[PDB]
Amino acid sequence: MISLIAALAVDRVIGMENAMPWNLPADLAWFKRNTLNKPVIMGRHTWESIGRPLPGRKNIILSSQPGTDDRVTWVKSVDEAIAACGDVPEIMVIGGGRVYEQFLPKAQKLYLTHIDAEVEGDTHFPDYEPDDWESVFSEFHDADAQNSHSYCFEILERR
Ligand SMILES: NC(=O)c1ccc[n+]([C@@H]2O[C@H](COP(=O)([O-])OP(=O)(O)OC[C@H]3O[C@@H](n4cnc5c(N)ncnc54)[C@H](OP(=O)(O)O)[C@@H]3O)[C@@H](O)[C@H]2O)c1
Ligand SMILES: Nc1nc(=O)c2nc(CNc3ccc(C(=O)N[C@@H](CCC(=O)O)C(=O)O)cc3)cnc2[nH]1
Ligand SMILES: [Mn+2]
Ligand SMILES: [Mn+2]
Ligand SMILES: [Mn+2]
Secondary structure, three states: OEEEEEEEOHHHEEEEOOEOOOOOHHHHHHHHHHHOOOOEEEEHHHHHHHOOOOOOOOEEEEOOOOOOOOOOEEEOOHHHHHHHOOOOOOEEEOOOHHHHHHHHHHOOEEEEEEEOOOOOOOEEOOOOOHHHEEEEEEEEEOOOOOOOOOEEEEEEEEO
8 A cells, every 4th residue: 555645835845955844843843753664755855854763664765766875775666666565455645746646546545634724835746636535634733832733634535
């Protein structure tokens, strides 16, 4: 099973200038809980944005060019990325925009955080078709001293 996990600001913005400009510790904690002990697939730009391997997860990087760091696994196509995960129950695709576009048709589950923040961005989450997806979990949180925007954790499963 393939799942996508992402945090979306208003208008599906997910990034600006190869960064995420907000800071929501509760959402990073949610990301860690839902990805720990699973393989994570990411594109090269997102690998450069994170800047280090994510511990406790098999890190698989998509790039058309040879890898430059043997602490992670480098692959050259979507099919190779999936194969490199082996026989696991759940593969987590962690972006960015181009990678999400390619894996969306193959995904059965979306873990989405909707952040009430207006962000200028240059990268968006793919338009998906709402009729294809059932919301099976949602949990709203107001802003607090640690998290400066309200946010909504949602899990959707392909109908
Ligand atoms: N809010 C969130 O949840 C979230 C999550 C992840 C990322 N982001 C943000 O998203 C932005 C980065 O997204 P992005 O769309 O620019 O880039 P991306 O999807 O992270 O990376 C694109 C790169 O991945 C490689 N790639 C993708 N598909 C491939 C394929 N089929 N075969 C081989 N290589 C492939 C290529 O690398 P080469 O050029 O080396 O071939 C391509 O240039 C950043 O702003 C980041 O902060 C946000
Ligand atoms: N909901 C969601 N939020 C995100 O921030 C997110 N980020 C990415 C890609 N970028 C990043 C950037 C930083 C870290 C990171 O530092 N993660 C730590 C945080 C642990 C914690 O704060 O409790 C980790 O070990 O996962 C992960 C992914 C992909 N999907 C996401 N999905
Ligand atoms: Mn092929
Ligand atoms: Mn197999
Ligand atoms: Mn806000």
